[PDB]
Amino acid sequence: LVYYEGGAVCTHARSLWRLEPLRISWSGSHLRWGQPLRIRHVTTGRYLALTEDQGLVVVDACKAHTKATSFCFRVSKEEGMGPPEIKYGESLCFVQHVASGLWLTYAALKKKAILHQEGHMDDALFLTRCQQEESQAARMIHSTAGLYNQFIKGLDSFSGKPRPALPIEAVILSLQDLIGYFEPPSEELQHEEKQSKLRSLRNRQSLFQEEGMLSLVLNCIDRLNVYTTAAHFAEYAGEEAAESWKEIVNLLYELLASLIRGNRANCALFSTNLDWVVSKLDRLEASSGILEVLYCVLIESPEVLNIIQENHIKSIISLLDKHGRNHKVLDVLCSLCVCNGVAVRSNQDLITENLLPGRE
Amino acid sequence: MDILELSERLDLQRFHSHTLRLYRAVCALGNNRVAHALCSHVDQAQLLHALEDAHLPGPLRAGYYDLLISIHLESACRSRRSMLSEYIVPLTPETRAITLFPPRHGLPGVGVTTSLRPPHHFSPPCFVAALPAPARLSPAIPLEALRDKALRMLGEAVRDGGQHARDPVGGSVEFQFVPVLKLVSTLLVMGIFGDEDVKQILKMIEPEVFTEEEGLLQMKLPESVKLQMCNLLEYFCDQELQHRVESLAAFAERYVDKLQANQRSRYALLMRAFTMSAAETARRTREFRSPPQEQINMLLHFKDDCPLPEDIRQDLQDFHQDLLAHCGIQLPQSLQELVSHMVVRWAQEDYVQSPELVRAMFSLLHRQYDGLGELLRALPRAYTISPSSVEDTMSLLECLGQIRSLLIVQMGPQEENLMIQSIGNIMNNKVFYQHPNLMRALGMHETVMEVMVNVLGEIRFPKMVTSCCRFLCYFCRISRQNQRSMFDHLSYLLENSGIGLGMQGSTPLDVAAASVIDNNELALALQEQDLEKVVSYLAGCGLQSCPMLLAKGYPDIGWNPCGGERYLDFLRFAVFVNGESVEENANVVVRLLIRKPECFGPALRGEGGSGLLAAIEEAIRISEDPARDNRVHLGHAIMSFYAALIDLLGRCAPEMHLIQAGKGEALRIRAILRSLVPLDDLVGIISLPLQIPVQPKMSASFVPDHKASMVLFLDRVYGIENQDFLLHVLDVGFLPDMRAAASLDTATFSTTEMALALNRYLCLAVLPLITKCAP
Amino acid sequence: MADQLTEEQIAEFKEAFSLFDKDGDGTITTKALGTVMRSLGQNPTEAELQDMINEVGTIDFPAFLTMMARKMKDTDSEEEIREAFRVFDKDGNGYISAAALRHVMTNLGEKLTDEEVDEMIREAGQVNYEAFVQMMTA
Amino acid sequence: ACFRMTPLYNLPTHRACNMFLESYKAAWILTEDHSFEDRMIDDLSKAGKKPDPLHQLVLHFSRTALTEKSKLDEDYLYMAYADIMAKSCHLEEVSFEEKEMEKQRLLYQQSRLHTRGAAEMVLQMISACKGETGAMVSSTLKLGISILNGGNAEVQQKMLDYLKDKKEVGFFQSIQALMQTCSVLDLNAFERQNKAEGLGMVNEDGTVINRQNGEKVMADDEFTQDLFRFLQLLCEGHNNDFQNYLRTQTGNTTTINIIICTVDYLLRLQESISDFYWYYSGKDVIEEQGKRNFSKAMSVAKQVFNSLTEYIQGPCTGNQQSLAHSRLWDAVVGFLHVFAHMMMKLAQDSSQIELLKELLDLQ
Amino acid sequence: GVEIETISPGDGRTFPKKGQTCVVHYTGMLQNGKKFDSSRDRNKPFKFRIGKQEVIKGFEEGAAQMSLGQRAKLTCTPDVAYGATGHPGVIPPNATLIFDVELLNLE
């Protein structure tokens, strides 16, 4: 479905659209009126066309005919860089299908879009530009979503079937490079540059959260962490995958920690999925990543703390008792008590009544 | 292993430092029971020995000092810091002895001050007491050896810094100075230090300027200790300002005694006069009939008429010159000059890159260079109380501190119960009723609304919300100035009360309703946005039924009359004031109701066209069958909603004199109100009889107050002028009710509350109407 | 509005309630409320007390405070008539004239206008002090 | 109820002290003129490399404003210091030498601030408001007009350099939003205000602060005047660079027509003043209560017209062509109609000559 | 019950009487051998009146069986002392307590 929603959806990656002219040579010329060009969604990768099945429905690139997917621009109803220009923000434009010739207007704030012949007088659209960061992030969302969907499909192919090949190398490289991409800015930079980098990082994380990549990462890591030991994955998958499984899970935990570092919305999203993190905390392999994930979730979102009950605190105490004396668990425990100037009495009482009385 | 051995063992030292951090965090922001548990884990003596130790590592020493302060002094220090801003000075004999200058400036922070501050509550730790909810007190410390011991460490650290050793305690000068100075600053904020201790601390701060070795400001310091020095100087300046306020209050008492004696003398002289003039008597009448604020304004005007002798004017001028001299206006040897020069030099020597230090240093700089401005800003919080109410005011202040302590604590059962107990206590105190200006200056309303918003943001703890709303309503009812102060947050309250909770008792919408009542100014100042939000909520009230009603087993319908009844009541209160209708708000209410037809009931909609009389008949039929509808009955809900709508429409009608004048707006509104509801509907509703006593279910019965709204509409919008119309409506609806009341006047049915309700009806809704059109 | 009552009256009310506030919770029975009212000397009728209780068992200090303020509004109004009669003319013996109206308008304290004073006089040398006071009270 | 007002001597001393404190703080210490901003700004800028305390203060404010947040908190210290700096450079026939000396003194007092980085801080904190009114942004505008007072040239160059280097777009969005919110004379509100003013000046048993509460109509008159004065001083001196930059910013992603928004606000003010005249068309004379509001609106119109003039002044073809194609013509026609009828209505009487003088000045 | 293991001799004649104030210096010790409470660390005697319910049952019963100047080791069973619920973060459940207490004065 194609909507005309307005508001927070404007800043999200789904609102972005790309315009690819039919001709390949000198395709970067200025957009003249009547030029036959296509419109595609940058994130999903599908191609928008006026198919007879459902009118205005976006379709995959596997079937998009020129006569069915071409579009034209008209100012009114009525090689080289070539034509000078059409203004951004000040020049209106009317969308029109090349073959059908029907104007684009709202069919009926999730109002559907249909190509009625009458159209409307206020159906004109004016163009605005998007900076490099948004386009780069959206295309990365597309590529990572495709690769990760292929990986999770391959994982589900042999689920519970003891014995193609999973692209372990490409997946590992993607995780490492995404970790590098979401690296926090260093504190040595001045306040202006550091603040600009932090704002850019927050925008990038918000784009990833809106695109739904976080849910897919949760699905992938849940599927990969069903198994217990590398020998078990060797049994279901093979030796080659078993060798890289530790790296894959470590990098997945690292990416999950990085995607929710400092943003309130991403960590508040875990208000209902906290029990999953607490349950998978106790795993031996890849423990530092899940501990860092929990620490970031607890420090960033105050609303998460009210969900925690006695069993989660007891599990944290179990982690402290079973994984030596590390200060990260104790920092997590300290952050549990106080959140940005307000104290939670219940969790403080549980902490003071579980670990302290035992004296062991 | 020795605690001192951890110097080489980095991992164990780090783990112990973070363990101390956890100990602080669990016992942070109150939680005195956990503080007792930590006292069990960490003994009084153990902490004392560590504090005086010299070989302890830096992080461990800092963590130990912070642990001691957080489990022994934190809550009392927080309460005292909260009290530090409110100045309540009683007129005690010690207060009148306060002098602005010593009999040059004196040493700041030393002397006597009568400002009323609550005492500290402590409980000794005894861990074999029988297991027993009371608000458990914080742990107890000797607090007397601590004073001298802190002074001793401060002196020893100053001497060691003067010696310029290469092995400072804790491994750095910061770890040697910052924690002990933090402890000393907290002890000063608490006020434990006496006159001699304050004098010695002042001498340590500056040996030359404050004289009655080397100064601690004179020697080189890093930024971290500069932050605590800045805090200490801020506390000292605050103490100086408090002393100035106390002296100003003492002079106020003296001068008002003189002024009231002079005013009585002037009254006697004026009364003795016989044939002065036609203006001298006018002057006396103007001076003696104006409100006391006006009188004290006229008498205090002799600057740059004024029936005051030159002696009192000269005395006030002398006090004014003394106060300007004290402020440093002059129109290092003193505190202001010393702090200013220290701040300037600190900023000049190095480019400090710690934002907190910069902020605090410049805050002191502004406070010192603007003393008159600081005094002017602090004066509104100041107040004067009679010496006879000091105990009650102390109890009120303790209750206020207790309720303020819950501002930074998540809401729970014990906390909400203690909150309710505090509200009951503040209700039972008489000072809250005697002085509304004091009650507003302490500003309990702000923190009470903050707690209400914190809990509101399904709403848990409903009883505490209801008691909070009752307290807010009573505070509004106390005084008109408090009413203005609460109305200033009307939009905020309405945003909180956007969705009616529906719980029994008071609601934030009731707080909003009580915030604007019996005052023309507030109703005229009622802005567009609040009314627009209210009517939007009413419109949304007509699209779906109440989720609580659906979850209660009630049959599902397309709307919830109970939810809209509160909005109709609020609109009725906001339209009708002092037995009159305000035109500006009536215009807005009519237009906003008519813009959205969904605000009205589904029967009055143009599409359905059920009709109001038919709707009420269907409501009565529904109430007849229990299956079709304490537990709120749907028939009574729809009946009350329609009655409230009719009442709002009637009370929103233009005034009779406006109609007589012929102003277009009033005639247009009366016409549209007539068009909305026909007269036949009113006469039919009045025609409907009411069951009389074996008394019917009062909640589900046909309440006469519905007819009260109906007859109010009939009297206001339409009126009775024709003999035939009056006779017809009267015969149809009015006589049978009077006959029923006369029959029920018998002693067997006199005590029935149905008879009382119908009596209140007759005497307050219809009998005045018959009286008015008697001729 | 509870600001009408004087601090002496509010102290008397607090003492009267504390005389029967041995429980400490603040709750007072309806019979206890009537006993407190009798101790105050009002001696209100049973029907009036029941109506006041039903208007707003569960009687607390603020509720009795509001009830007493509503009751004492009548006493304040009773003294108001005498105050107006004694303030219309200082001597109060046939001293009604336009000069008194001019003096009142000059120093009313609310900054009244000459036209407003003329309108008030028209509401109603020769003048009636009682009629003028009644017109001012409307 | 005024007759039954109790005298002062009957009241207890514990409340008489309270009203004595209130009257004292209202009438004596508030009127005391303490000129101490100059001494502070001189002491802090002496520098005794390492920046002087004034530069550190400006840097700390810039750092506070640059921190990302939903909305900047009402910082009591920033507002206070901003006023201290602003009044410092405001002020401390006439011959040419004396006027030149006074001007040079004003430029030196402005250089005491604009070389420390005051302009960058002002732009940062007005851009960080995200288009929301308040007292802190009002103090920021006060500091801006004080720095730009007298049509200083180097300050405008520094502002242009910083604004182009940062390439931020939120500054013009904030200005547009702030100008959108600015109020215009409203007949309905005035009616509520004058109905409220008809009530007693003394409440029952207490004084009424209705007069001290302030007028509800044209409440943001000082704010609007300061904003338009800041804009006109920003384009003061026939600086062609800003005259071309305000209409359209080439570097920034989105262009905001500040001049067209100013014309839209002027048209809104014209509609409001025409409605206000139509309300007073029937009445023979003009009441003083409405006369004060009329004069306030007249001053606001004068300020906005001066701002538009200062935009136009200089051979800037782009701004002139943009304004020729806007809705300014309909506004001007409406002004001409209301001005003519206002002149004739005032000339009918003789007790409102000052309002006629203001009318002629705005003409 | 409680077992009074006499650490040191004390004056035999003096014994606690109901309604009298007892000052003690108890050095509490957990069952495992760890120390949780000590009055001597606080340097303040633990004043308590015998016959009331202010102090836990085992310590009161043992104090009834004490004598002036005498030292003893009073192991208290969990049912007697803080049974099945302990002071939060101080005493674990169903754990015995061992006290080292000697009397100072009986007045």
Author numbering:
A (entry chain A): 244 to 321, 332 to 361, 372 to 426, 434 to 630
B (entry chain A): 1648 to 1750, 1759 to 1787, 1794 to 1873, 1923 to 2014, 2020 to 2046, 2091 to 2216, 2222 to 2393, 2414 to 2477, ...
C (entry chain C): 1 to 56, 62 to 129, 135 to 148
D (entry chain A): 3634 to 3681, 3693 to 3736, 3750 to 4020
E (entry chain B): 1 to 107
Text taken from the publication that reported this structure:
Ryanodine Receptors (RyR) are intracellular ion channels that control release of Ca2+ from the endoplasmic and sarcoplasmic reticulum. RyRs form massive (~2.2 MDa) channels that are embedded within the membranes of the endoplasmic or sarcoplasmic reticulum (SR), where they control the release of Ca2+. They form homotetrameric assemblies, with the bulk of the protein exposed in the cytosol. Calcins are a family of scorpion-derived peptides that can penetrate cell membranes and bind to Ryanodine Receptors (RyRs) with high affinity and specificity. Upon engaging the RyR, calcins cause long-lived subconductance states, which are readily detected in single-channel recordings as decreased current levels at 20 to 60% of the full conductance.
The 22–30 loop in IpCa contains a consensus motif (RRXS/T) for PKA phosphorylation at residue Thr26. Thr26 has a minimal solvent accessibility in the complex and forms extensive interactions with RyR1. Addition of a phosphate group would lead to substantial clashes and thus preclude binding. To verify this, we prepared two variants of IpCa, containing either a phosphomimetic (T26E), or a phosphorylated Thr26 (pT26). To obtain a good reference structure, we collected and solved a structure of RyR1 in the same conditions as the IpCa-bound dataset but lacking any bound calcin (see section below), which also displayed an open pore. Thus, the combined cryo-EM and functional assays show that phosphorylation of IpCa by PKA effectively neutralizes the calcin, and in a cellular milieu, its potency would depend on the relative activity of PKA and phosphatases.
